[PDB]
């Protein structure tokens, strides 16, 4: 069967940093030269990251390392009791910022480009606001891959959030707790039959390999984003001492959505763009197909197509009407957008980590191997 | 590994009638006596029927035959070019009514009870209106299993209907056409991630899901326009079928409605919303099953897992219905059986032959139409 790290999730590298929330994976170079400016992947913390690193042929991380990027990836710890009080803020501080700090220390580069996928995109979005407000310059650009900002139309999840249960948890928040992967899967699972082509056993395995979340983080996510749609209203939430205002984000943004995505409706993603009014530029790219088939659409096979349009009208239907279709994988377009923002070519590093951050264990590390807690 | 008719869809019987749209399957009795009044299953047409007849343990058809019902089932023909002009009305006439006429002729019984599942329930609803208006008495009761009547909240499908495409097809309706299984699977999706858990499951369901059908363009276009966009059934006379202005307040037989609590395809409160429009009926029953679209609908008595909820009161607010409901362990099929059986006549000896002299058995169940594969890409 599947053994994570052995016949799945095999892109070579090392865990180079670990804390109470993350392992940071640094991938081994496969090119003689690399773009100097690192690339940080922020996967979701619902399910395991390795949707982005399945087999070599369909691995997103492997592709980008092969394009010369200095790829680092956040591997989230599945919640256990010592994490029962962790909050959304913990994911910003101990997740995104801790990762960014380690990247700066290891590479000696002052900044990086960031990618956030699914809920990792929402965490990244909030992290960007905190960083901007505090003058912390971690990121030179941000990419949001099938992630919401405007949660007004979150899809069918809207019908299945139990507001009374969220309120019950809020009442007892200070005690913390653990939300089971089983519970999370009833609302946040993202696999559909049409993603299985026709290993589609890889995807079936991934879908069932669930992870747990801290109660405070999860309850806040439901209340503030899904119910209150807080990000569209400046100052509606406060994180890390900062009133959150998406209009303050001030770096180039790339936003990817998939046309047939039933999990993150493409028009709902598109709706976020108008809120990013402090950015110097925004790029929206629409991939063909469904959530997984469209998102994880590799260049190795280069199937399907994507659409581009540099004009960003308010109406997504107008965007699409003016768009140009291009054959193959949107990864190519993202690469072309990222590369000019990635510095000059330098020799590939000969070692993983650094003296201060020595390699700890081979990729894919220990946190991705955890099994969800037993039923309670 | 899956061979339809051999290790799935194996409830014994015979095709006893065939026309350009349907094969009617009559199932072999497994009881010495049967309820006299037959039971007609009108399955989904957007997918193949055999979600209702998977493995023996989870087969709905097999269970009901084993309870003593004289079960007949409509197996819909996947659309081919000779069907490219078929309409919604065709599904009423060549589907539901043709089946009911054959049942009458084979059994010599004047009426039957009907079950409609998913879009089969919608077709059945419209057929009941036509029959009522024309004084045709085919049905003594109707059961709607995860089917909409009020389409105001149809769920995620709303986001995946392109009105402009519907309109362009309306403009060219006379020419007819075929809507591919691929297109159908991009707008309708019967499965969710919880149905795909893996450690046959989930492969039996994936095979069923991927065993796609095609639909005639006029039927499918009408379905999208009139139900999903216009929500025509809630307005008397908003559509006309078979010469008849459709007014669901005219339906005048007992109704049973099933929905599943965690159903993402047919939201249970959306199903519930239809009940208030069935104002001509002598009785209405709503039953809510635990779990999702597949596991909640096809929840067999053999294992008798999960639960269902009952409440005789029918308030406008579905939350009020649920707050007043009583939970019962196991399968809702038990409840449906208890509702159906008193409406199913006396016990008579099981028929010794399938079909009749006029309707001889044509081939063993599950027949030929179910074995057809979708047309190639174009």
Partner-chain contact A207 B192, CB within 8 Å: no
**How many Cβ contacts (< 8 angstroms) between chains A and B?**
57
Q: Is B104 exposed, middle or buried (0-12, 13-18, 19+ CB in 10 A)?
A: middle
- Closest by CA position to B170, among listed B230, B246, B94: B230
Catalytic annotation on A129? no
Minimal CA separation from A206 to chain B, in Å: 10
Which residues of B carry out catalysis? Answer: 118
| Distance in Å, alpha carbon of A374 to nearest chain B alpha carbon | 16
Q: What are the tokens at B112?
A: 């039957």
Q: Mapping DSSP to helix (H, G, I), strand (E, B) and coil, where does residue B360 land?
A: coil
Identify which of A186, A196, A260 has the shortest CB distance to residue B186.
A260
Give A-chain residues touching B160 at CB under 8 angstroms: 260, 262
DSSP assignment of B299-344 equals --TTTT-SEEEE-S---SSHHHHHHT-EEEES-HHHHHHHHHGGGS
- Residue among B160, B193, B199 minimizing CB distance to A191: B193
Alpha carbon distance A21, A221 (integer Å): 17
Cβ pair A318, A295 in contact under 8 A: no
Give resolution, Å, one decimal: 1.5
Residue A238 CB neighbours (<10 A): 12
- Which residue in chain A is spatially nearest to B292 when comparing CA positions? A186
- Contact (CB<8Å) A189/B189: no
Which among A191, A207, A262 is the nearest to B156, CB-wise?
A262
The answer to whether A205 is annotated as binding is: no
Nearest to A367, CA basis, from A13, A11, A25 = A25
Q: How far is Cα A22 from Cα A15, in angstroms, rounded to an integer? A: 10
Indicate yes or no: CB of B197 within 8 angstroms of CB of A190: no
SS3 A210: coil
DSSP 8-state assignment for residue B350: P
Q: Cα–Cα–Cα angle for A255, A258, A264, nearest 5°? A: 85
DSSP 8-state class, residue A320: H
Residue B212 is given by DSSP the state -
- CA-wise closest residue to A117 among A306, A318, A334: A334
Q: Residue A19 in 3-state DSSP?
A: coil
Domain residues for A173? 1-376
Token pair 């919880």 in the structure block, residue: B194
**Is the Cβ–Cβ distance between B324 and B317 less than 8 Å?**
no
- Pairwise CA distance, residues B223 & A176, whole Å: 49
Determination method here? X-ray
**CB count in 10 Å sphere of residue A82:** 9
Distance CA A266, CA A194 (A): 17
Interface of A with B (CB under 8 A): 155-156, 159-160, 185-186, 189-194, 196, 198, 201, 204-205, 207-208, 260, 262, 265, 267
Q: State the Cα–Cα distance between residues A283 and A167, nearest whole angstrom.
A: 38
Taking residue B85's Cβ as centre, other Cβ atoms within 10 Å add up to: 16
Phi, psi of B348 (to 5 degrees): -135, 160
8 Å CB contact between A220 and A169: no
DSSP strand pairing (A22-27 vs A33-35)? unpaired
Domain count, chain A: 1
> Using CA atoms, how far apart are residues A229 and A150, in angstroms rounded to an integer?
7
> Alpha carbon of B98 to those of B18, B68, B252: distances in Å?
9, 24, 21
* Phi, psi angle pair for B214, to nearest 5°: -105, 155
Mutate to test the interface with A, among B196, B264, B271 (most CBs of A within 10 A): B196
**Which residues in chain B have their C atom more than 2.5 Å from the N of the next written residue, marking a break after them?**
199
Are B156 and A260 an interchain contact pair (Cβ–Cβ within 8 Å)?
no
Contact B113, B228 (CB under 8 A): no
Q: Is B149 helix (H, G, I), strand (E, B) or coil?
A: coil
Check whether the bond before B219 is cis (ω within 30° of 0).
Answer: no
8 A C-beta contact, residue A22 and residue A95: yes
Partner-chain contact B189 A194, CB within 8 Å:
yes
Last residue before each gap in chain A (C to N over 2.5 A): 198
For tokens 């399910």, name the residue: A47
Question: How many Å lie between the alpha carbon of B198 and the closest alpha carbon of chain A?
Answer: 6
- Using CA atoms, how far residue B234 sits from B151, B230, B274, in Å, is 8, 9, 8
DSSP per residue, A156-188? GGGGT--HHHHHHHHHTGGG--EE-HHHHHHHH
Closest CA to A364 of A62, A37, A35, A112: A62
Q: Comparing C-alpha atoms, which of A109, A143, A107, A108 is closest to residue A26?
A: A107
Nearest to B174 by CA among B87, B90, B239: B87
CB contact under 8 A, B197 and A186: no
Whats the size of chain B, residue-wise?
378
Element (H, E) at A119: helix A119-134
C-alpha distance from B193 to closest chain A C-alpha (Å): 5
The number of helices, as runs of H, and strands, as runs of E, in chain B is 12, 17
The Cα B310–Cα B296 span in angstroms is 15
């Amino acid at each position: 069967p599947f053994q994570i790290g052995k016949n799945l999730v095999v892109t070579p590298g090392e865990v180079v940093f670990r804390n109470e929330l993350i392992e940071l994976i640094q991938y081994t170079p496969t090119t003689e030269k690399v773009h100097e400016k690192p690339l940080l992947f922020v996967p979701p913390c619902i399910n395991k990251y390795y949707l982005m690193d399945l087999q070599p042929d369909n691995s997103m991380v492997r592709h980008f390392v092969g394009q010369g990027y200095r790829v680092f990836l956040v591997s989230w710890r599945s919640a256990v009791p010592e994490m029962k009080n962790f909050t959304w803020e913990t994911y910003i501080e101990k997740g995104v910022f801790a990762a960014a700090e380690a990247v700066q220390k290891i590479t000696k580069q002052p900044t990086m480009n960031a990618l956030g996928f699914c809920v990792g995109g929402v965490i990244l979005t909030t992290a960007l606001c905190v960083a901007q407000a505090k003058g912390l310059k971690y990121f030179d650009s941000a990419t949001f891959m099938t992630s919401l900002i405007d949660h007004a139309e979150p899809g069918e999840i809207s019908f299945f959030i139990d507001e009374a249960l969220v309120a019950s948890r809020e009442a007892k928040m200070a005690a913390g707790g653990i939300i089971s992967g089983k519970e999370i899967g009833r609302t946040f699972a993202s696999l559909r039959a049409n993603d299985l082509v026709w290993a589609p056993f890889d995807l079936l395995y991934w879908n069932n390999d669930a992870v747990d979340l801290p109660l405070p983080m999860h309850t806040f996510m439901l209340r503030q984003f899904y119910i209150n749609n807080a990000l569209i209203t400046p100052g509606a939430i406060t994180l890390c001492g900062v009133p959150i205002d998406i209009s303050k984000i001030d770096i180039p943004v790339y936003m990817f959505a998939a046309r047939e995505d039933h999990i993150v409706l493409w028009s709902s993603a598109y709706s976020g763009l108008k809120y990013l009014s402090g950015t110097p530029s925004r790029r929206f790219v629409l991939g063909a197909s469904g959530h997984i088939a469209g998102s994880i659409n590799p260049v190795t096979k280069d199937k399907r197509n994507y659409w581009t349009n540099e004009q960003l009208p308010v109406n997504p239907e107008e965007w699409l009407e003016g768009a140009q279709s291009h054959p193959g994988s949107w990864w190519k377009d993202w690469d072309a957008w990222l590369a000019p923002q990635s510095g000059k070519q330098v020799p590939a590093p000969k070692m993983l980590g650094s003296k201060e951050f020595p390699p700890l264990q081979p990729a894919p590390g220990s946190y991705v191997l955890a099994k969800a807690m037993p039923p309670v």
